[PDB]
Amino acid sequence: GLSDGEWQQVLNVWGKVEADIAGHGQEVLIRLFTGHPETLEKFDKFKHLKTEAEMKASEDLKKHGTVVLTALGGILKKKGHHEAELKPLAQSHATKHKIPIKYLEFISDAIIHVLHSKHPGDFGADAQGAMTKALELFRNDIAAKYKELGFQ
Ligand code: HEM
């Protein structure tokens, strides 16, 4: 449950991401893959990436970062009213991709990390609070769908 003020912060921060969706998407995935190497194993199309240089050079990684952040942005713009947007993602990630909720925790923290990295001094305490709550909400609603499916 986010306040309207918190949602305003979320979408204000998102404006930073939208100015360079590919660049943000790329760094988020790289932070995920290098911080938690087991997550790379879930991607048949990225598991060949052995070095961070290779990750940085991959146009397809950037493409997927765009896909991921575009989807997340679509969800965030719904300000919590995201059942229709979220259900297919929970379903594909539980049943097809088999992504444990732990990895969604990982990518949530990676997003926070990247925002501070790209916008140091410009991602204030209040903005971080609001963004964190938004990502928790996202995670929590996926977790509900996971429980429904008995997916661990
Ligand atoms: C903000 C969090 C995330 C969002 C919004 C997101 C969104 C998406 C979307 C829109 C797709 C393509 C459509 C689909 O297959 O449902 C996708 C595919 C995929 N996602 Fe996620 N994802 C997220 C997190 C993750 C994480 C943390 C992992 C693994 C650690 C992951 C693994 C995958 C894989 C393996 C695919 C298929 C890629 C392919 O082979 O083309 N996702 N994701």
UniProtKB/Swiss-Prot annotation:
Highest taxon above the source species: Eukaryota
Residue ranges occupied by any Globin domain in the UniProt entry: 1-147
Principal location class: cytoplasm
Residues at which nitrite binds: H64
Binding positions for O2 per the UniProt entry: H64
Pfam families documented for this protein: Globin
Subcellular location, record wording: Cytoplasm, Sarcoplasm
GO annotation, cellular component aspect: sarcoplasm
GO biological process: oxygen transport; removal of superoxide radicals
EC number, as in UniProt: 1.7.-.-, 1.11.1.-
Keywords from the named record: Cytoplasm, Heme, Iron, Metal-binding, Muscle protein, Oxidoreductase, Oxygen transport, Phosphoprotein, Transport
Binding residue positions for heme b: H93
Example GO molecular function: peroxidase activity
Family: Belongs to the globin family.
Function: Monomeric heme protein which primary function is to store oxygen and facilitate its diffusion within muscle tissues. Reversibly binds oxygen through a pentacoordinated heme iron and enables its timely and efficient release as needed during periods of heightened demand. Depending on the oxidative conditions of tissues and cells, and in addition to its ability to bind oxygen, it also has a nitrite reductase activity whereby it regulates the production of bioactive nitric oxide.
Protein name as catalogued: Myoglobin
The species this protein was found in: Equus caballus (Horse)
